[PDB]
Design a binder for this molecule. Structure first.
Ligand SMILES: CS(=O)(=O)c1cccc(-c2cc(N3C[C@H](c4cc(F)c(F)cc4F)[C@@H](N)C3)ncn2)c1
Lengths: 726, 726
């Protein structure tokens, strides 16, 4: 029969997945951008209109990579001159377009090299960060109001996060939060003054005669962390002659006693904001609820209104404490916390009451709270069919927790077992996004009766195309390690024959709270390996995995590099015993945390694996950042966990690599997992006389995602795997 | 028959070459160190005595890596705490041992971290450099005299060379020169104030949490060069309260007009010193002869006594203008210069006469002047048998240039065709060092009649050992490219059969004035490749090669990366046509300049080569240092030679690498050929979609010579070559 899914198909993206990215602008309408122009859709009937023609900016004179329409509908923020920084951060130039007078605003424009910009929640106010300082614009064409003056490159950050906060706690560059109606603008300030710098070379274009040395404040495990402060400013009480006044919100006392972090800020009402703080020993977190004092101007956070969230088995939250969802009056809220049984479920709080009431329970977990009406609470969980790798939308009646309704489970159980959702402003309508096991399916629904309004995108075009190619299949199942079940998935070659013995590749990540076994549909390298090369690509979620309760997730607490790598070995051991696996050809590969695990496995001396590839792996935890490492490892001091820090390195296992074929890959400009980590691995291997393969990627970071580097690394890795298996 | 010469033999040095390193202390005696103690030998009779027992320093409390006996015989300088810097530079601790009172001097000792130390030519005076300043010690136990105060790390160097002067012009760290009887101490001062810095990471031991950034003043092609000044101080006119007075010798005017270098300093007499200066455009050099003015204290360099040495076909000298050899009265001198025919021969000068008289001539070259008596001039050349890859000692009668006698040619023409020599103080005796084609042979001779006194070392032990192993053979011959003959050598596998077709590896260097085809005996990687793997390892000396006249050497003037790489291709092309070469398996490899050539060849699109290895290659000349690059390339400016600078890069040929298997290797701590050079090569290959192999060596420099890295790189390269050939 026809052709298979080739490497070129993957690298050249011959089989494209269609999406349906919409942006709700009201409770009844959403904007649906296209290649050319933006349309506005009526959710109820489905009729649309052109919001603005593609031609509108034919002669803008700049390539626009992104737009942003004020909640007003009145203005359009045009982003261009994009220059990526870290995972989320970047700088760009901005122009505002008046949709009213259809004129491009040319006076008092936003400066170039702006670090961040955001419209207020309602009007058309603007808040942006430039040169590490915050600026507010009440009107697009009016002069800016400077809010901060302490901004200082690599030292003081106002309104934006520093390297570690961007990557580890906020997953964003932005560090500013508008109040609901736009009156107040809250923000955090980070001080990196004494944070050590990581320095590495950047070669740039061939014409650069001397390499440049990049240096960024980066706190490695146990090093000096950046400090943080929080402020709130009334954007309605600013002159044009008076330097704005930011009111600081400090403490709590339980946090100030030592190193700590700001891990969450969520507005409750127009005059109430909630803040969550975490101790450097991410065992203990505290939430403060603060109110604006009218005839005083300051903010007060009544103790008694603060809630403590701690863990005795591990750290707090999956990656960081969950965000609260306040009721209309801000007098109560719902937030996901760990059960007394170790499972994450929704707990209901009264802002001034210590104990909360769990509204959901069971041996499954709530992934997230998606919407909250006065009537219901909508959330996504993996309860359905008891499979932790599945996701479905559910709604629970606030009047009776007994009444929970699954809104996605039965829509199409064969094709859809993994959903994400997007609600309109007042949750009157919602879009469901099915991403597997079948082809992605996007639909619209109305909340009143949960009626399906219509299909938005069903990827029928991709479907027709794929029936002419021998596609691999996916098996999602579990095995049983002493009492507990652990899930795994296998990308099976077309025409799988359980009678035959196939070579197997263990695709691994295995970081804390990770999940590599799910019902998501994917077209990746594994697809090619199975379809064209007839290689089985498996993934296993062992100890340390997430979404299955803390007994499993917290198993590797203070013990990274132990049970999670061991279970990976044990899984392969069980796979090679299912009958369709050639135990003479079992390989393993991983990126990031998976690179670390891959390396630890290859250096375990288990003998189970013939070869393996590690891409940008961590080699010893003292080299990785403080916020992430310490969360699971504690401090690298003899009084705390130094011994295990020293026992879990890859280099200490160098000798065992004599029994395997290892390929080490790393980008030279990796600001996240520093090239240093692989430099130390290679050195320990050389010092022990172990031969291996290596490949550096000049000027590529942790993603090694530039077009050319991407195709090149996957091509290099394909040759390596085939050589090992053929 | 028995075994072959294996990789392990090479890496573990199972077959050791014996040497006979002696150190003349007089015109009749020499010191011959041993593993344990130092002996003193009488050259005439051969009888010896113990100069000092090994036990002498049993409880010194430090490992002594080197000794240095004052020309006095009175003191012994003990060097320990050695810490290597660049190719020649390093720091160490020193202790002086009084051989008279057999006591270790403990007062006013030389400081630790001393950069350089040297005894005066006769007495026991000491001159050392510490913290970039010069210090003189008239007596080992007496306080030091500070000579300079401008010393400043990475900025001002007194008595020592900066990075580029150490590597490119003086081939030494030392930048100070004692006068004949020790009265005067001359020295150079280097200013790196505005020299750009090369910065790169050094990872150090696993325990280093943050990598360190190394920065060294390094002028890349066309950048700002360091400036130099010269001084002479009378070490007999120093108090202990008065700051010493250094008399500066400036100019010449023809040099001061622009950028220039100090390329040689040679004392003529007790009160006369010669200096050679070179313009940044190393086309023109000027020699100054300066005399000490008694009743004035300063030094005067009479114009009329200065000699200009320039070249119209290329640069001056092989690497730098040759050194002069003055007659007893310092009124005349002999120095090697290029012929009117382009061949380097000895020219005789009268210090105050413009034109010199050539005392030797012919289509061969004088390699170096080894000794000068009032009677004869001893020199080494490649005249014998007309083979430029051979070396022999000759003596020419100063009274009649017609009388030239070869002193080594016939000693043992079968085993010895490559000699080096070592004369006693007054050239009364000399040791000959035969290094090929047979096993190294060391002998002693007396100059009066050139009588052979006795054999010092004949490597008979190694000889007995090697007759039990299938050793490869070496073929030295030449081919003819349009009128001119170009030499090559081939390491042939044991039992070579011209009827069989062997795979061939082109071992290449090819830099300007290089020679890879000679009669030297070697036990290296090539030995293993031929003996055990039956691979022919050839080397070719094409355009640009040295020791054959300027028509050949200067052929690549201002044109690096052209004829020298082309001829390498042409050679392989002719080798694959000799009948015993499998043209389907021809590879090429090189280090340093040879890495550059290897890369240029592999990217030439010739198709002649299947695979190739480049170790620490230069990729584009603007990345290499000024002194070396500019000597052959001129300046990288549109007014000079920028176009060719841009036309001779490796990356510009990236596309052509699709036809070959390439292995790129480079040490991350390469202070000479910066990792940057390979980083840019890999990047251009990735951008073009070319797959290749790579290997970085963490913390290794240009030599990748640490024990573990050395074994590892040659092991990695052996696998690569075998895979390409098998
Ligand atoms: C006889 S002498 O007159 O004492 C005298 C003096 C002063 C220098 C010399 C000399 C210098 C030399 N080199 C080669 C070298 C080099 C070239 C490359 F292309 C590289 F990629 C890396 C390199 F290290 C460069 N760094 C200097 N090779 C031989 N002889 C010889």
């Amino acid at each position: 029969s026809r052709k298979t899914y080739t490497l070129t198909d993957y690298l050249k993206n011959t089989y494209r997945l269609k999406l349906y990215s919409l942006r709700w602008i009201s409770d009844h309408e959403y904007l649906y951008k296209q290649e050319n122009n933006i349309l506005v859709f009526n959710a109820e009937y489905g009729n649309s209109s052109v919001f603005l023609e593609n031609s509108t900016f034919d002669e803008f004179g700049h390539s626009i990579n992104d737009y942003s329409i004020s909640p007003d509908g009145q203005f359009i923020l045009l982003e261009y001159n994009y220059v990526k920084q870290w995972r989320h951060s970047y700088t760009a130039s901005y122009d505002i377009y008046d949709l009213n007078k259809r004129q491009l605003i040319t006076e008092e424009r936003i400066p170039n090299n702006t670090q961040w910009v955001t419209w207020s929640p309602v009007g058309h106010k603007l808040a942006y960060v430039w040169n590490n300082d915050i600026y507010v614009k009440i009107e697009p064409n009016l002069p800016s109001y400077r809010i901060t003056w302490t901004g200082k490159e690599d030292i003081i950050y106002n309104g934006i996060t520093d390297w570690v906060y961007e990557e580890e706690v906020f997953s964003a560059y932005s560090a500013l939060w508008w109040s609901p109606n736009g009156t107040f603008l809250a923000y955090a300030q980070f001080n990196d003054t004494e944070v050590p710098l990581i320095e590495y070379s950047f070669y740039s274009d061939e014409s650069l005669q001397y390499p440049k040395t990049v240096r960024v404040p980066y706190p490695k495990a146990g090093a000096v962390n950046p400090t943080v402060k929080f402020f709130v400013v009334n954007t309605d009480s600013l002159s044009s002659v008076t330097n704005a006044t930011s009111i600081q919100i400090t403490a709590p006392a339980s946090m100030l006693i030592g190193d700590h972090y700001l891990c969450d800020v969520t507005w409750a009402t127009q005059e109430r904001i909630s803040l969550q703080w975490l101790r450097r020993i991410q065992n203990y977190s505290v939430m403060d609820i603060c109110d604006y004092d009218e005839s005083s101007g300051r903010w007060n956070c009544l103790v008694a209104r603060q809630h403590i969230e701690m863990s005795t088995t591990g750290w707090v939250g999956r990656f960081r404490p969950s965000e609260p969802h306040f009721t209309l009056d801000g007098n109560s809220f719902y937030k996901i916390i760990s059960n007394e049984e170790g499972y994450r479920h929704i707990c209901y709080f009264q802002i001034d009451k210590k104990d909360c009431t769990f509204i959901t329970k069971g041996t499954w977990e709530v992934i997230g709270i998606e919407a909250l009406t006065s009537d219901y609470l909508y959330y996504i969980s993996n309860e359905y069919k008891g499979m932790p790798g599945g996701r479905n939308l559910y709604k629970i009646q606030l009047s009776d927790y007994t009444k929970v309704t699954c809104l996605s489970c039965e829509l199409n159980p064969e094709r859809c077992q993994y959903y994400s959702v997007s609600f309109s402003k007042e949750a009157k309508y919602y879009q469901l996004r099915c991403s597997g096991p079948g082809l992605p399916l996007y639909t619209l629904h109305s909340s009143v009766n949960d009626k399906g309004l219509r299909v938005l995108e069903d990827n029928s075009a991709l479907d027709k195309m794929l029936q002419n190619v021998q596609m691999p299949s996916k098996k999602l199942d579990f095995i049983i390690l002493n009492e507990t079940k652990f899930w795994y998935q296998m990308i099976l070659p077309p025409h799988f024959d359980k009678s035959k013995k196939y070579p197997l590749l263990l695709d691994v990540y295995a970081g804390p709270c990770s999940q590599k076994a799910d019902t998501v549909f994917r077209l990746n390298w594994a697809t090619y390996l199975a379809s064209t090369e007839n290689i089985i690509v498996a993934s296993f979620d062992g100890r340390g995995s997430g979404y299955q309760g803390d007994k499993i997730m917290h198993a590797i607490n203070r013990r990274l590099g132990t049970f999670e790598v061991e279970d990976q070995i044990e899984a392969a051991r069980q796979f090679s015993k299912m009958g369709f696996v050639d135990n003479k050809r079992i390989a393993i590969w991983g990126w990031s945390y998976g690179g670390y695990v891959t390396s630890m496995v290859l250096g375990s001396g288990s003998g189970v694996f013939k070869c393996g590839i590690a891409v940008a792996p961590v080699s010893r935890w003292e080299y990785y950042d403080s916020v992430y490492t310490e969360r699971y490892m504690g401090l690298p001091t003899p009084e705390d966990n130094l011994d295990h820090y020293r026992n879990s390195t890859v280099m200490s296992r160098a000798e065992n690599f004599k029994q395997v074929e290892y390929l080490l890959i790393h980008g030279t400009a990796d600001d996240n997992v520093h090239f240093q980590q692989s430099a130390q691995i290679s050195k320990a291997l050389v010092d022990v006389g172990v031969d291996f393969q290596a490949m550096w990627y000049t000027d590529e970071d942790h993603g090694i995602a530039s077009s050319t580097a991407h195709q090149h690394i996957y091509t290099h890795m394909s040759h390596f795997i085939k050589q090992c298996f053929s």
